Amino acid sequence: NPQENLPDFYNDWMFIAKHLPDLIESGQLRERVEKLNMLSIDHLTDHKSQRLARLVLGCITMAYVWGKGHGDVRKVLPRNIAVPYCQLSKKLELPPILVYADCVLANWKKKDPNKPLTYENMDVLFSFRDGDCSKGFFLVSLLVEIAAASAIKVIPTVFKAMQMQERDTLLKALLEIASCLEKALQVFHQIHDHVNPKAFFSVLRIYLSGWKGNPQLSDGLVYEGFWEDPKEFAGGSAGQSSVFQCFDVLLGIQQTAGGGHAAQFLQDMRRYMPPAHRNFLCSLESNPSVREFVLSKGDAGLREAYDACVKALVSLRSYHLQIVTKYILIPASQQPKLEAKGTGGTDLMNFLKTVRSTTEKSLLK
Amino acid sequence: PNPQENLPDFYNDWMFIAKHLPDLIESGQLRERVEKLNMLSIDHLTDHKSQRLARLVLGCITMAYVWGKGHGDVRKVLPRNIAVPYCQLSKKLELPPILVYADCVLANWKKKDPNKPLTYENMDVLFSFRDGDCSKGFFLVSLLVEIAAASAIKVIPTVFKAMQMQERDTLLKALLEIASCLEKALQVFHQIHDHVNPKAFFSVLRIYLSGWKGNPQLSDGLVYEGFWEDPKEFAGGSAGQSSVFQCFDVLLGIQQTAGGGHAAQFLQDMRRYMPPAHRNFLCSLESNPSVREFVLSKGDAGLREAYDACVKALVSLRSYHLQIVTKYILIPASQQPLEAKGTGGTDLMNFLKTVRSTTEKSLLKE
Ligand code: HEM
Ligand code: HEM
Ligand SMILES: N[C@@H](Cc1c[nH]c2ccccc12)C(=O)O
Ligand SMILES: N[C@@H](Cc1c[nH]c2ccccc12)C(=O)O
Ligand SMILES: OCCc1c[nH]c2ccccc12
Ligand SMILES: [C-]#N
Ligand SMILES: [C-]#N
Numbered sequence A: 001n002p003q004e005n006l007p008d009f010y011n012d013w014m015f016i017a018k019h020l021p022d023l024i025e026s027g028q029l030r031e032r033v034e035k036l037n038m039l040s041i042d043h044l045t046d047h048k049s050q051r052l053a054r055l056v057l058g059c060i061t062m063a064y065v066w067g068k069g070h071g072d073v074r075k076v077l078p079r080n081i082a083v084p085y086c087q088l089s090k091k092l093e094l095p096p097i098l099v100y101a102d103c104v105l106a107n108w109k110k111k112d113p114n115k116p117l118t119y120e121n122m123d124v125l126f127s128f129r130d131g132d133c134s135k136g137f138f139l140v141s142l143l144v145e146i147a148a149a150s151a152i153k154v155i156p157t158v159f160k161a162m163q164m165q166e167r168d169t170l171l172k173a174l175l176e177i178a179s180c181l182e183k184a185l186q187v188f189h190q191i192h193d194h195v196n197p198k199a200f201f202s203v204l205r206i207y208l209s210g211w212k213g214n215p216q217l218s219d220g221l222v223y224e225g226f227w228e229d230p231k232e233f234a235g236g237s238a239g240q241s242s243v244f245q246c247f248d249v250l251l252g253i254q255q256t257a258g259g260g261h262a263a264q265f266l267q268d269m270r271r272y273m274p275p276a277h278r279n280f281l282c283s284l285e286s287n288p289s290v291r292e293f294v295l296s297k298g299d300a301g302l303r304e305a306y307d308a309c310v311k312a313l314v315s316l317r318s319y320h321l322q323i324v325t326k327y328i329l330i331p332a333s334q335q336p337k338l339e340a341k342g343t344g345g346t347d348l349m350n351f352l353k354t355v356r357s358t359t360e361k362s363l364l365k
Numbered sequence B: 001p002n003p004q005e006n007l008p009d010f011y012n013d014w015m016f017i018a019k020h021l022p023d024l025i026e027s028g029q030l031r032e033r034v035e036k037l038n039m040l041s042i043d044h045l046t047d048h049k050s051q052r053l054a055r056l057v058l059g060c061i062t063m064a065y066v067w068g069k070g071h072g073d074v075r076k077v078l079p080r081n082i083a084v085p086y087c088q089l090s091k092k093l094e095l096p097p098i099l100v101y102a103d104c105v106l107a108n109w110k111k112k113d114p115n116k117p118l119t120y121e122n123m124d125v126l127f128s129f130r131d132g133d134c135s136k137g138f139f140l141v142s143l144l145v146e147i148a149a150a151s152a153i154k155v156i157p158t159v160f161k162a163m164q165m166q167e168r169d170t171l172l173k174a175l176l177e178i179a180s181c182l183e184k185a186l187q188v189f190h191q192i193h194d195h196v197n198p199k200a201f202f203s204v205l206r207i208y209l210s211g212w213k214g215n216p217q218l219s220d221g222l223v224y225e226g227f228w229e230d231p232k233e234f235a236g237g238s239a240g241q242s243s244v245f246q247c248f249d250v251l252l253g254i255q256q257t258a259g260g261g262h263a264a265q266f267l268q269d270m271r272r273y274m275p276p277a278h279r280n281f282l283c284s285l286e287s288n289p290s291v292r293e294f295v296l297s298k299g300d301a302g303l304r305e306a307y308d309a310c311v312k313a314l315v316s317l318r319s320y321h322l323q324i325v326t327k328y329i330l331i332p333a334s335q336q337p338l339e340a341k342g343t344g345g346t347d348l349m350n351f352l353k354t355v356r357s358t359t360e361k362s363l364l365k366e
Helices: A008-016 A020-027 A029-034 A047-066 A079-092 A100-103 A134-164 A169-191 A199-209 A242-251 A261-272 A277-286 A288-298 A300-333 A348-359 B008-019 B021-026 B030-035 B047-065 B080-092 B099-105 B135-164 B169-197 B200-209 B242-252 B262-272 B276-287 B291-297 B300-335 B346-361
Strands: A108-110 A123-124
Touching: A008 A020, A008 A047, A020 A029, A020 A047, A020 A242, A020 B030, A029 A047, A029 A079, A047 A079, A047 A100, A047 A199, A100 A134, A108 B021, A123 A134, A123 A277, A123 B169, A123 B242, A134 A242, A134 A288, A169 A242, A169 A261, A169 A300, A169 B300, A199 A300, A242 A261, A242 A288, A242 A300, A242 B047, A261 A348, A261 B169, A261 B262, A288 B099, A300 A348, B008 B021, B008 B030, B021 B030, B021 B047, B030 B047, B047 B080, B047 B099, B099 B135, B099 B242, B135 B169, B135 B242, B135 B291, B135 B346, B169 B242, B169 B300, B200 B300, B242 B262, B242 B276, B242 B300, B291 B300, B300 B346
Parallel strands: none
Antiparallel strands: A108 A123
16 A cells, blocks of 8 residues: 655655646756755655655656657756666666556555545556546556456465365366456456547657667666666566466466567566566466466366466457557557557567467467 | 486487487588488477486587588578477477577586596586587586585575574574585686687587577577477577576675666576576575675674675686686687677677676675
8 A cells, every 4th residue: 555755855856746747748847857956765764665756756757758758858867866766776676767566556545545446436646747547547557457466365275276186176266266367357448438549649658668679769768877878678568567477477378488579578577576576476487387287187177267267368468459459559540650669668569469379379178 | 316318219310310410510411310300209208307318419419400510501490300399398398499508518417437426537428519529528517516516505595594593603604605615616617627628619619509599690590490480599508597606696685687788688588598497496596585685784794704705706706717718718719710709699708797797796895
């Protein structure tokens, strides 16, 4: 449950970021950033505050770099921000750029402190532009994660059942896992009610983009006073969610095998997540293979239960491709004047088709 | 335990080509024997040991086929009757279908006298590429440095146990034991000068360890005919693919894989060029609380010095390693008519010095 306020010492940062949709319209955001002082991170108390502080320097860096978002960029980040950001990013073992765990996972609050985590009772902590649909987009993302995260607590039952040779317990656990992925798909449906296609594509989207393989910062960002040469880091995406990567690992879909670009991207995004998230994926891989266990057992009900989890991942990814049609492909086709790139930096159609197809190949006959 | 030395009779056609690479390459007839092979199922490799020896046999054959005599006439297509079982076997072991450190060092040896110790003069390799290539001395000394470094692996649990039990004295003795294993390993590394000739290594053996990822001679990769339709790119071998040698940076909190740079990228990438148990061990080491944070918070000069003996021994290993690079690459490269590439594909001088300096910066200044 994420902190909403930093100490008053950091009040200078909190103001630029909570009043970001208007500093940006008024073309005075670059100056107020450039008119800041290098406030040291020593006055950051617990983890909560440090996560919040990262989300604050993240939205500010993205605001500074992309500005109005229609071409006028800044290839150099002032030391007033770059140094504290980079110091706090090294402490959290993260790159100095906004990542999924910042802008989705630390970026919310509930209205009634003891009423359920539903879209009506929740709100985001930070926006970029008026009408960007950032609340609908960040919160539906968070809601889908939460729904799929329900299966995390059954994963230990899966491995215990295997090591103890508990066939009925294994089968019920896999069906429960498939059940949660189906619910996460239903939650996904709500994105249509809260995110507008044109607003997402032309307003919000560029604030999530990064400087890794981006022609508009073909050398990356230079973090003044921390590194002399510029560095490249990828923009955000849910490819940076350990929850969504974890189902492939759990089921023995080897998304990170083979040496290709999609495999390379998914492995790379694991050091764009908090170390505990990356460690969870590690620990999952270190266990015996759920897939290899089910394959060897000559058991139709167990095979069918395993297949239910893979079908549900295919359903998610195909629905997600239709989300892509409506929120990227069509809006891109509807604007004044060569391969469509994701905020994470990928050749998005080939990447997404490769990942779905790899899922598909895991379906057991 | 000991690597398997023979495959089932079913795979005799493989074993024959892998055991006779010096003469088959020299005589100009290795590729024709490979191209005339039959496709053999991998379904007769029953246990893990046979699969490991099979990967080594197939890996050496693949390098000999692609590189040939090692002076330019390369092959960009790997014939299906090798490609297909090689790719299937590789998939089962979660390894790329190219020769890696775990094949040509960790599985490429046997002892002469069973009840005698693992020392250079009681050991031998299973496969070589070319007459006069120093592969025997090169692979065995590499293994010997690994075995000496690996004696530290069994004290690693004591380290994390000592931390959580607040067992200060036990921690210190464990860290000193580790620094001692790493100094042992630096001593065994001296054996390389006695069994590897620099000219043979550089101009004869090195080309057989090189791969097809960012490599001029095979700019799109290699086609594994009959198994994937498009060429695939894989890096060549190096001890960057040893979990033993990466694990000390992890245990000591030296963040060699942080920062997004090339060296970090290479060292993380090599973790899927090592068997899964090896990879799991690295990231499990990364799951544990930081030894470095523990020592730094304790105000204990003895603790800090035991940690620093470890960092310093790593620095000595890598500085000596830079001299071996001068003797076996830079001098032989100058000695015959952009930036020198290692068999692993790195810009090796920037890369090795970046990794050395990241070690140096971990020394306790307090
Ligand atoms: C407007 C809505 C969305 C758009 C346009 C979109 C687009 C994309 C793009 C372009 C990529 C490729 C990576 C890159 O270069 O950025 C990607 C990957 C990914 N996205 Fe989305 N996304 C949206 C919402 C979501 C949501 C709500 C989820 C939550 C389940 C999600 C889950 C994923 C995952 C897990 C990946 C990695 C690929 C995979 O595992 O299939 N996305 N997405
Ligand atoms: C003739 C002998 C050797 C030469 C010429 C050599 C050269 C190189 C090169 C060029 C690299 C860069 C990666 C690449 O692109 O290949 C490298 C990395 C590395 N080498 Fe060697 N190497 C030799 C023997 C050894 C041995 C015996 C060890 C045993 C400890 C070792 C340990 C390492 C390690 C651990 C790395 C990864 C970088 C690091 O962690 O410092 N090397 N070496
Ligand atoms: N990757 C998406 C943007 C995106 C969607 N969900 C995200 C969550 C976090 C960061 C970025 C995103 C795109 O290219 O359009
Ligand atoms: N990387 C070394 C070759 C090498 C040394 N030790 C190895 C162990 C395994 C594979 C290759 C190697 C080079 O560029 O010359
Ligand atoms: O690209 C499809 C999005 C996706 C992949 N894996 C998931 C797991 C749970 C919820 C969504 C996804
Ligand atoms: C989706 N990113
Ligand atoms: C050393 N490779």
